[PDB]
């Protein structure tokens, strides 16, 4: 059974694997989707929001009464917000002043203080403001693109969950790369801790194929395509890099809801699009492909994902 969780941060993870049935029709491989939308604040980032806070508590970088600050325009802010609300830390998030009002309302519902930075300055301006605030005594900055506790929580939770739920039947792991923590930690766990052969595939936007050595660019696949190679991405455990267009990411996310009853975000379609291409290769006939679906469709009502439904 599950334990009684002493606060909501302890309840991260333990997400289900769901077999894909219609998008895979005609394939002889098996595609399993890990539903990271079923987390305490409904994304994969909940794992690293909890883990980065716990890690800083253990090392003494974060003490009761201190202030947390991070620049993030995505799910990491929601993850830090619910953790800090659960564990009692004041949290400040910096982000470009063009962040949607829907995301800002979610953040403020956890009591996060929002510092908007000029929109022309983009993410660079939010990063600069956060680093300035973090330099104040009493302030802690998790640094999602550098913190080893990010991939470590995937070694400790996401990876074992995949390994154990599949009873060791996982031949391919496909993951969109934002920070790279998910793919890094799951691949480290499978290849290094369990000594298990697995073909590890990173997915990035065709419009911003930086892992493959291409130029950064603007794209609509929220949560991946950072525009740089993050320190938390360990290329030495990744076997292949696939690119996915914005349109096929959006379309595949729509098809996951329509054909499988899985309501998920745009990057879920990006990951599934790459997974389905790998799963169709004859050399994986009879093999099991696992992919991560980072969050839930409702967080995307005002985005391109729902343009076709007004």
């Amino acid at each position: 059974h599950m334990p009684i969780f002493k606060d909501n941060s302890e309840s991260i993870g333990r997400t289900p694997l769901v077999q894909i049935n219609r998008l895979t029709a005609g394939l002889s491989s098996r595609v399993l989707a890990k539903i990271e939308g079923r987390n305490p604040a409904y994304s994969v980032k909940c794992r690293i929001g909890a883990a980065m806070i716990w890690d800083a508590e253990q090392s003494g970088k974060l003490k009761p009464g201190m202030h947390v600050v991070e620049p993030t325009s995505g799910n990491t802010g929601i993850a830090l917000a619910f953790v800090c609300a659960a564990r009692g830390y004041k949290l400040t998030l910096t982000m470009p002043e063009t962040m949607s009002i829907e995301r800002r309302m979610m953040l403020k519902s956890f009591g996060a203080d929002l510092v908007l930075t000029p929109g022309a300055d983009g993410m660079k301006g939010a990063i600069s403001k956060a680093e300035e605030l973090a330099a104040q005594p009493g302030w802690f900055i998790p640094q999602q693109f550098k913190n080893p506790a990010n991939p470590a929580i995937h070694v400790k939770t996401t990876g074992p969950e995949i390994w154990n739920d599949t009873e060791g039947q996982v031949d391919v792991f496909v993951a969109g790369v934002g920070t790279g923590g998910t793919i890094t930690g799951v691949a480290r766990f499978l290849k290094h801790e369990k000594k298990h052969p697995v073909h590890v595939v990173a997915v990035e936007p065709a419009a911003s194929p930086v892992l493959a050595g291409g130029p950064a660019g603007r794209h609509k696949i929220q949560g991946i395509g950072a525009g740089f190679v993050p320190d938390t991405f360990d290329r030495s455990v990744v076997d292949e890099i696939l690119s996915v267009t914005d349109d096929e990411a959006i379309e595949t996310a729509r098809k996951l809801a329509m054909e499988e009853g899985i309501s998920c975000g745009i990057s879920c379609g990006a990951a599934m699009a790459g997974a389905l291409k790998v799963a169709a290769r004859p050399e994986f006939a009879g093999k099991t492909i696992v992919t991560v679906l980072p969050d839930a469709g409702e967080r995307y009502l005002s985005t391109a994902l729902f343009e076709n439904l007004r």
């Binding site: 620049p71 993030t72 325009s73 995505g74 799910n75 990491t76 470009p96 983009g122 993410m123 660079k124 990063i127 999602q144 693109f145 934002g178 920070t179 911003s208 950064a216 660019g217 603007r218 794209h219 609509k220 696949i221 929220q222 949560g223 991946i224 395509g225 950072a226 525009g227 740089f228």
Partner: peptide, 8 residues
């Protein structure tokens, strides 16, 4: 359009 860590 996301770049430079935007959206994560």
């Amino acid at each position: 359009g996301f770049s430079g860590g935007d959206g994560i």
